[PDB]
Design an enzyme around this catalytic site. Structure first.
Site, mmCIF file in Angstrom:
data_model
loop_
_atom_site.group_PDB
_atom_site.id
_atom_site.type_symbol
_atom_site.label_atom_id
_atom_site.label_comp_id
_atom_site.label_asym_id
_atom_site.label_seq_id
_atom_site.Cartn_x
_atom_site.Cartn_y
_atom_site.Cartn_z
ATOM 1 N N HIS A 175 1.025 -1.538 0.017
ATOM 2 C CA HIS A 175 -0.075 -0.090 0.111
ATOM 3 C C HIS A 175 1.083 1.280 -0.334
ATOM 4 C CE1 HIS A 175 -3.384 -2.593 0.727
ATOM 5 N NE2 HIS A 175 -2.712 -3.282 2.033
ATOM 6 N N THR A 208 -6.134 6.172 7.563
ATOM 7 C CA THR A 208 -6.876 6.852 6.274
ATOM 8 C C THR A 208 -7.253 5.900 5.344
ATOM 9 O OG1 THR A 208 -4.838 7.614 5.462
ATOM 10 C CG2 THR A 208 -6.278 8.989 6.874
ATOM 11 N N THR A 209 -5.960 4.445 6.156
ATOM 12 C CA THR A 209 -6.693 3.629 5.302
ATOM 13 C C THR A 209 -7.606 1.846 6.423
ATOM 14 O OG1 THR A 209 -4.170 2.340 6.741
ATOM 15 C CG2 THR A 209 -4.184 3.558 4.260
HETATM 16 N N1 K7P Z 1 -2.820 6.987 6.795
HETATM 17 S S1 K7P Z 1 -2.071 6.737 8.294
HETATM 18 O O1 K7P Z 1 -1.001 7.576 9.050
HETATM 19 O O2 K7P Z 1 -3.713 7.342 9.001
HETATM 20 C C1 K7P Z 1 -2.389 5.022 9.235
HETATM 21 C C2 K7P Z 1 -3.054 4.920 9.029
HETATM 22 C C3 K7P Z 1 -2.699 2.879 8.765
HETATM 23 C C4 K7P Z 1 -2.047 2.676 9.709
HETATM 24 S S2 K7P Z 1 -0.867 1.554 10.567
HETATM 25 C C5 K7P Z 1 -1.530 -0.622 10.130
HETATM 26 O O3 K7P Z 1 0.134 -1.432 10.279
HETATM 27 C C6 K7P Z 1 1.102 -1.027 9.325
HETATM 28 C C7 K7P Z 1 1.994 0.123 9.683
HETATM 29 O O4 K7P Z 1 2.398 0.258 11.320
HETATM 30 C C8 K7P Z 1 0.722 -0.904 8.375
HETATM 31 O O5 K7P Z 1 1.488 -2.287 7.409
HETATM 32 C C9 K7P Z 1 -0.695 -1.287 7.338
HETATM 33 O O6 K7P Z 1 -1.095 -1.900 6.326
HETATM 34 C C10 K7P Z 1 -1.685 -0.480 8.526
HETATM 35 O O7 K7P Z 1 -2.940 -0.534 8.149
HETATM 36 C C11 K7P Z 1 -1.035 3.895 10.886
HETATM 37 C C12 K7P Z 1 -1.594 4.760 10.236
HETATM 38 ZN ZN ZN Z 2 -1.117 7.573 6.228
#
Ligand code: K7P
Ligand code: ZN
Ligand code: K7P
EC number: 4.2.1.1
Length: 257
Positions: free
Chosen positions: A61, A195-196
């Site tokens: 991603h 945001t994911t």
């Molecule tokens: N775009 S954002 O800053 O809102 C955002 C969004 C999600 C997460 S964490 C989660 O787990 C891991 C990352 O440690 C990654 O490998 C994963 O894919 C992720 O979905 C963290 C921050």
């Molecule tokens: Zn992000």
């Protein structure tokens, strides 16, 4: 199976992650005329002098630069935050073209990309516990515009060839995330979400007013990454941004006049 393609992109996410249509979703458009200056907001405290970067990962991603968060080595405090938030990773979102890529927008303006420095609230003990809390995360968002090179970004750009495909990682020690900051720490702040997927409503968003400049060559190298795994059909990792979500019953506050 969620992604950014024609058939699994942000408009599909609600089918597996119903919180996608929730009350505090991110990103949002920052309407600079309606954001209220809050003179009660403190200066942000970015303490990254002892940061320990470990590894860079293509997760299919984006890419994450991962930090040792087993001690208070790289912390965010002050501004809107109560207590101490530990840096766990940073990543970017970027476009297929310079005209798009950011998740946050400013008066509907899209930047070429957006950096997310992700921090968790040390009163919850670990990142998995923090994401279950309305004040569990603090994400520092920094806009990228295309212009002059960002010298402190080039060590990231140069390792991307070694993690071209999903699941690839590389040792990434002694990287100094201070080299990714703009001059000014003036910011907007509002309550939001990841945001994911899983889009958890656990984030205090701190978005810096001042964008950083990167070179065309730097962002072109982001766009050579792959969403796919090795030996699968090439899908360029571009346009990995979620669009602006409804503000609903939220106020964006400005640290500056
Ligand atoms: N775009 S954002 O800053 O809102 C955002 C969004 C999600 C997460 S964490 C989660 O787990 C891991 C990352 O440690 C990654 O490998 C994963 O894919 C992720 O979905 C963290 C921050
Ligand atoms: Zn992000
Ligand atoms: N965003 S979500 O988690 O709600 C989600 C969304 C869609 C699916 S199926 C979808 O089908 C498409 C055409 O077959 C394929 O091209 C996609 O790769 C595949 O993902 C599964 C889960």
């Amino acid at each position: 199976h969620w992604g950014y393609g024609k058939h699994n992109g942000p408009e599909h996410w609600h089918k597996d992650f119903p919180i996608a249509k929730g009350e505090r979703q991110s990103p949002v458009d920052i309407d600079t005329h309606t954001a209220k200056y809050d003179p009660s907001l403190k200066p942000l405290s970015v303490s990254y002098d002892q940061a320990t970067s470990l590894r860079i990962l293509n997760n299919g991603h984006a890419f994450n630069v991962e930090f040792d968060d087993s001690q208070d080595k790289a912390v965010l405090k002050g501004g809107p935050l109560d207590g101490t938030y530990r840096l766990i990773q940073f990543h970017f979102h970027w476009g297929s073209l310079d005209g798009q890529g950011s998740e946050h927008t400013v008066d509907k303006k899209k930047y070429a990309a957006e950096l997310h420095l992700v921090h968790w609230n040390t009163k919850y003990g670990d990142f998995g516990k923090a994401v279950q809390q309305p004040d569990g995360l603090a994400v520092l968002g920094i806009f990228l515009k295309v212009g002059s090179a960002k010298p402190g970004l080039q060590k990231v750009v140069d390792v991307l060839d070694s993690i071209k495909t999903k699941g690839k990682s590389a040792d990434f020690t002694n990287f100094d995330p201070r080299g990714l900051l703009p001059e000014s720490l003036d910011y907007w702040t509002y309550p939001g979400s990841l945001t994911t997927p899983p889009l958890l409503e656990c984030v205090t968003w701190i978005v810096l007013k001042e964008p950083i400049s990167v070179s065309s060559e730097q962002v072109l190298k982001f766009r050579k990454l792959n969403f796919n795994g090795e030996g699968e059909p090439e899908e360029l990792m571009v346009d990995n941004w979620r669009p602006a979500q409804p503000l609903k019953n939220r106020q964006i506050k400005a640290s500056f006049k």
